[PDB]
Design a protein around this ligand. Structure first.
Ligand SMILES: [Mg+2]
Lengths: 119, 76, 49, 43, 212, 49, 130, 317, 46, 111
């Protein structure tokens, strides 16, 4: 029965399971390098690192494959947009992304269940 | 995933002869050596367009149709 | 039409009006308007090409 | 009046589906083999 | 919790790399393009997103919701004249998509540009769209004022959509705004125009109800 | 006035530069307007069938 | 007292829902006659333009107009985001899925094949009989 | 009634040729009415006798379905293309392949010969058309600019020398010299799968499942709109007497007046005995050089041959 | 050393395994039930 | 532009069959269809081919008759290709011609 439940649950193969673990390990080593770099910037030690790749640094530096918006019949050279408020004392990685679909739905499912069982 | 269909093909115009001869490579196949470097043309007896222009095709077609039907009749 | 021809030239022919959607008339018979241009002009364009 | 499996005639005849005026031509293997050519050279 | 703009730019690097990789993978269906443009507009970096929508229109210019999202980004971020250019290019390249015309005549009315919406409606009646388009332009007029110009629109609409139901609706209009003599002139023009052998009952039914 | 001589090319000289480098396909020419008919009307029943 | 009924039929088109949504927004709006008569008296001859008059590249809307447009468009985005209402999740039904996507695919199977596969489910619930 | 249409005598089937083992996807007539080629999905090309309807030769060599076949008028050659990705020249002196035209990234759907230059043009599924020199087997130009598979192509000697419709619902009129689009005609709503050229009047027709359209040549003006044959049409062919033939995927075939745009006959032919009701379909149709026989390559692995009915007017609208 | 009498537990695992794997994969179902082969699972089903 | 030589033949055939079906369903749907639902019809065609090979009678209870007829058409076409390839390789194996071992196993499995 235990093997029956454990095999009725599974849908993933070898490569999906190694990629999920690789994603968790990449997240862990990213938080570790983040802590090391945060300490080096907090005390203040300007050790620079390397980069060995052709593409990839072209994303933050500039607009990647930029197409200019086609212009005509209306002057649009004067108007501009206002940048985002930084606010780096409340802002979190979850805040930029927005709430998760599973998280919100999960929450409601909770509420739903609660009300049903209470009634 | 890995095993997946296509739903769009690979487009042409970005390799070996497509825009600037792929910037003039010095690589060439053995199938790209000179071969049949002379176009053969239709001669006067074959079906040259001088001979095809004046021909009434309907009479000759009807005659060949009649001969084929007569052959099929005389066989059985 | 000028907002339609951004990167095109001035002699490019594009269709953007509703008068381009209405059918023309029957164009009755052997009219010298709808004719393949000229056999010597055909030979000239053939030689150029 | 039993019909064996060896006959079992489905799919009625080409003369029955197209009629008498249409002449039906069933062509398996061909006249003039691949050595005997189409448009002939000037000999 | 993110500190100063180094770690913020690292997060932006990871997200833009993920989106550009998804674009490189598929290059088709615009959910990747729209999601990447929404993520770029959510961080108020809308020039990146202008580039994203222009690239996505280079991929597929006949996809109407892509135009709708790009123009509603430029309306949402207070860039009126950009969005105005976008709607003009939209109604130029897709003249049969009525969505663009309804939203652009709605934007010009919400911005207070009356005559701009009049000119867009006249460009729209150049294409001879449908019943609902002419009714929306009549409703635009009657919402403001101008029973005479709306009557001219009705004249054009009965000349370019000959149908007994449209003459009945214009008759009901001339009833409801108390121009019974003008309505009678419309009646005497309609019953002569339709002829003798074609008509269905409804014209003479509504005209008998009027004279009742 | 400038006298131009074409440089004399070495026969025993291999290709000079890398050519295998590849960049993605650029933007196509400006989109053409569609000139379609007015959207024949779709019904709920046929949409379900 | 007035009374108006407007239910929805089936989907059938992306343009019919647009038209319904446009009739809703265009009945909700209210015109200001003061700004209208002001711009009319300022513009004069060209206030009733043709397709080709001159004013295409002239209008500059003030802050109140663009604020009204932005607030209206935010309300329209909210009304669009409320389109697919989540149906309440009961856990008393015998679940026949092991994933999160399997439940919705079984729901689609019950949508499409649910009219035809009505005897076999009865056979299952009565004990694989009949 | 603004026009008065010319009376054309109705057509009738008189010969059903059979012997392919796959969908007959192409057909073409020799310049001398002695024989005609078909190409089919049984990976062969069959020379048939045009008078007797007898199989004259069978030529193997393709790896996949044969999609287009054409006989050259200036040279004694037989050009063929396939889903193989292979474009071939068959020397009919030897009945062997002498030249293969390499460079299509995917399946090749049609091909046409330029009538005066010795230049082959081909359609492919990789959204391109290619321009080949016959003598040097090399790609002169790659006509790119369609976004979906390219279905049909034609050639003139006069202006725009290459006209091609495709599955992106557009039609591009090109420049053979430059290699760039001159006119993009977007009027169709569904995929253009057949373009055809009129022999005299310097107009052309184009077909898609919504409707069929007639068009002036220099810049593509709208002239007319021939409607009523609403199925997926695969081929169009023009008679010099102004008879237009539209054959569809559902086997239905309509006969049309070129000038007035009038439908004078509808032909719904029947399938072969073993065949299935869902298998009625026309992939190709061609007139002979006498323009008095109509050869249709069907989806029931048949060649059906039609000729005019010799009985006088029982017709005229 | 395969087979014998069928219990309710093996039959319910067999039902759930047909619900997961289908009626054309019997060696994936019989890997879920020891002391029962694929022919036995197929026969017990039908 | 790689050539379909000998080990790409079945993969190229089944690559082109899918494309022909895609073009036909893009032309066959009427004007107000959401232009989704291509993948499902392709799965119905693959399942119809499996049910042809298994000699299982294939019927989907609700399905539009143009889609059902088109799937039957292309399944008959793939049946013809499969069967003619089997006849050809069986004649080759009978005469003693140069054949692969994999084509012997595939041909036994088809026969
Ligand atoms: Mg495994």
């Amino acid at each position: 029965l235990s093997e029956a439940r454990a095999r009725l649950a599974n849908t993933q193969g070898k490569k999906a399971k190694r990629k999920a673990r690789e994603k968790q390990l990449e997240e862990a080593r990213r938080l570790a390098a983040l802590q090391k770099r945060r300490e080096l910037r907090a005390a203040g030690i300007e050790i620079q690192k390397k980069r060995k790749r052709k593409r990839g640094v072209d994303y933050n530096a500039e607009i990647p494959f930029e197409k200019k918006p086609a212009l005509g019949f209306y002057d649009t050279s004067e108007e501009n947009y206002q940048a985002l408020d930084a606010d780096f004392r409340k802002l979190r990685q979850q805040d930029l992304d927005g709430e998760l679909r599973s998280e919100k739905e999960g929450r409601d499912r909770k509420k739903d269940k609660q009300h049903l069982k209470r009634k | 995933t890995a095993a997946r269909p296509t739903f769009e093909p690979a487009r042409g115009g970005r390799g070996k002869g497509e825009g600037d001869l792929s910037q003039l490579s010095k690589q060439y196949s053995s199938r790209d050596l000179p071969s049949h470097t002379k176009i053969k043309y239709r001669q006067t007896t074959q079906d040259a367009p001088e001979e095809v222009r004046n021909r009434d095709f309907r009479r000759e077609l009807e005659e060949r149709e009649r001969a084929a039907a007569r052959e099929k009749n005389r066989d059985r | 039409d000028a907002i339609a021809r951004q990167g095109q030239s001035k002699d490019k022919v594009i269709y953007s009006k509703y008068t381009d959607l209405v059918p023309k008339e029957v164009m009755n018979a052997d009219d010298p308007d709808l004719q393949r241009p000229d056999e010597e002009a055909i030979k000239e364009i053939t030689e150029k090409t | 009046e039993v019909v064996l499996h060896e006959d079992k005639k489905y799919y009625p005849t080409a003369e029955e589906v197209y009629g008498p005026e249409v002449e039906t031509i069933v062509q398996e293997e061909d006249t003039q083999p691949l050595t005997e050519p189409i448009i002939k050279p000037v000999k | 919790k993110i500190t100063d703009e180094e770690e913020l730019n690292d997060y932006k690097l990871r997200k833009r790399k993920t989106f550009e990789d998804n674009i490189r993978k598929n290059r088709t269906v615009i959910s990747n393009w729209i999601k990447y443009a929404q993520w770029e507009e959510s961080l108020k970096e809308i020039q990146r997103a202008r580039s994203i929508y222009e690239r996505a229109l280079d991929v597929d210019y006949r996809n109407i919701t892509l135009w709708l999202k790009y123009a509603e980004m430029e309306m949402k971020n207070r860039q009126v004249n950009h969005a105005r250019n976008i709607w003009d290019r939209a109604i130029t390249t897709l003249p049969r998509v009525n969505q663009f015309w309804y939203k652009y005549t709605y934007m010009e009315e919400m911005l207070g540009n009356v005559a701009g919406a009049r000119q867009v409606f006249e460009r729209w009646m150049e294409w001879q769209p449908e019943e609902q388009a002419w009714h929306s332009y009549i409703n635009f007029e009657l919402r403001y004022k101008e029973v005479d110009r709306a009557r001219t629109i009705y004249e054009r609409f009965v000349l370019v959509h000959p149908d007994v139901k449209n003459w009945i609706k214009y008759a009901r209009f001339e009833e409801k705004h108390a121009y019974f003599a003008h309505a009678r002139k419309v009646y005497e023009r309609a019953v002569e125009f339709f002829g003798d052998e074609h008509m269905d009952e409804h014209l003479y039914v509504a005209f008998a109800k009027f004279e009742e | 006035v400038i006298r131009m001589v074409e440089m004399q090319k070495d026969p025993m000289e291999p290709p000079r530069f890398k050519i295998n480098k590849k960049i993605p396909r650029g933007p196509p020419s400006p989109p053409a307007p569609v000139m379609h008919s007015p959207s024949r009307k779709m019904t709920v029943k046929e949409q379900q069938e | 007292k007035k009374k108006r009924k407007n239910p929805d039929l089936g989907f059938s088109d992306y343009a019919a829902a647009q038209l319904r949504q446009y009739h809703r927004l265009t009945k909700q709006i209210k015109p200001d006659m003061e700004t209208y008569e002001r711009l009319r008296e300022k513009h004069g001859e060209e206030f009733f333009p043709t397709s080709n008059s001159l004013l295409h590249g002239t209008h500059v809307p003030s802050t109140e107009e663009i604020d009204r447009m932005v607030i209206d468009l935010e309300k329209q985005i909210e009304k669009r985001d409320k389109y697919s209402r989540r149906r309440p999740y009961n856990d008393d039904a015998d679940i026949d899925y092991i994933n999160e996507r399997n439940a919705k695919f079984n729901k689609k199977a019950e949508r499409f094949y649910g009219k035809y596969t009505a005897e076999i489910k009865q056979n299952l619930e009565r004990g694989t009989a009949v | 009634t603004m026009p008065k249409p010319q009376w054309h005598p109705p057509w009738k089937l008189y010969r059903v040729i059979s012997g392919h083992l796959g969908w007959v996807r192409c057909i073409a007539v020799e310049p001398g009415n002695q024989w005609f080629v078909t190409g089919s999905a049984d990976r062969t090309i069959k020379i048939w006798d045009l008078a007797s309807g007898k199989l004259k030769l069978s030529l193997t060599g393709h790896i996949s379905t044969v999609r287009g076949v054409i006989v050259s008028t200036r040279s004694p050659y037989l050009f063929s293309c396939g889903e193989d990705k292979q474009v071939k020249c068959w020397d009919l002196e030897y009945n062997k392949v002498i030249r293969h035209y390499h460079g299509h990234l995917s399946a090749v759907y049609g091909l046409d010969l330029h009538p005066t230059i010795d230049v082959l043009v081909t359609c492919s599924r990789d959204s391109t058309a290619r321009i080949w020199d016959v003598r040097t087997k090399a790609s002169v130009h790659t006509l790119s600019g369609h976004t979906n598979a390219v279905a049909t192509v034609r050639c003139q000697a006069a202006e725009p020398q290459i006209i091609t419709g495709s599955h992106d619902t557009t039609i591009r009129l090109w420049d053979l010299v430059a290699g760039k689009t001159r006119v993009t005609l977007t009027n169709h709503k569904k995929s253009v799968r057949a373009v055809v050229l009129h022999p005299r009047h310097y107009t052309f027709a184009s077909g898609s499942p919504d409707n069929i359209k007639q068009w002036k040549f220099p810049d593509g003006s709208f002239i007319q709109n021939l409607s009523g044959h609403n199925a997926i049409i695969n081929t169009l062919t023009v008679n010099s007497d102004g008879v237009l033939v539209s054959g569809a995927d559902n086997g239905t075939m309509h006969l049309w007046d070129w000038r007035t745009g009038y439908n004078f006959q509808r032909v719904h032919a029947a399938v072969q005995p073993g065949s299935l009701d869902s298998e009625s379909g026309i992939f190709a149709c061609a007139f002979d050089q006498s323009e008095s026989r109509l050869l249709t390559a069907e989806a029931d692995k048949t060649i059906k041959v039609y000729r005019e009915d010799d009985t006088a007017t029982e017709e005229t609208h | 050393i395969k087979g014998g009498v069928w219990r309710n537990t093996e039959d319910e695992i067999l039902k759930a395994a047909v619900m997961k794997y289908g009626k054309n994969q019997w060696s994936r179902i019989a890997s879920l039930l020891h002391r029962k082969s694929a022919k036995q699972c197929k026969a017990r089903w039908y | 532009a790689k050539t379909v030589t000998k080990q790409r033949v079945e993969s190229h055939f089944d690559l082109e069959l899918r494309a022909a079906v895609m073009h036909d369903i893009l032309d066959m749907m009427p004007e107000g269809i959401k232009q989704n639902k291509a993948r499902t019809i392709l799965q119905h065609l693959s399942e119809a081919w499996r049910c042809w090979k298994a000699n299982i009678p294939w019927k989907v209870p609700g399905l539009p008759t143009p889609i059902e007829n088109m799937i039957l058409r292309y399944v008959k076409a793939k049946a013809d290709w499969w069967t003619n390839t089997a006849h050809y390789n069986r004649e080759r194996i009978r005469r003693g011609a140069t054949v692969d071992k994999t084509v012997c196993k595939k041909n036994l499995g088809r026969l």
